[PDB]
């Protein structure tokens, strides 16, 4: 399923809820059309890898989550596992998500 985090507080709760499952976080800006437009692959993959938890984060409504990570550009995807960050990359490349997931699956 997809989970929307509107605050860092929920971000920590979500990381704990995923447990040992892979966790991908999208920092795309909802106000930015080019970034939101890429949400279908990110969101669609949630049903492709239902064994992986996908989080969507708004740098504008969830700037507390993004400010903590010092995001310098969007869209940015971050990978977390067991509450541990194991990967990150930027660029509107949806296929790239598939490779990193397979790499950490």
């Amino acid at each position: 399923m997809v989970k929307q985090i509107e605050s860092k507080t929920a971000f920590q709760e979500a990381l704990d809820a995923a447990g040992d499952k892979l966790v991908v976080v999208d920092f795309s800006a909802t106000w930015c059309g080019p970034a939101k437009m890429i949400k279908p692959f990110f969101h669609s993959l949630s049903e492709k890898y239902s064994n992986v938890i996908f989080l969507e984060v708004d740098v504008d409504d969830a700037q507390d989550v993004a400010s903590e990570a010092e995001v310098k550009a969007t869209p940015t995807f971050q990978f977390f596992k067991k509450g541990q960050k194991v990967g990150e990359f930027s660029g509107a490349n949806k296929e790239k998500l598939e490779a990193t997931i397979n790499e950490l699956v």
Binding site: C32, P34, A73, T74, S90, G91, A92
Partner: peptide, 13 residues
């Protein structure tokens, strides 16, 4: 200098 593939934070937001 502005790439559509990336949104710049320079935006007032």
């Amino acid at each position: 200098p502005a790439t559509l593939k990336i949104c710049s934070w320079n935006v007032d937001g």
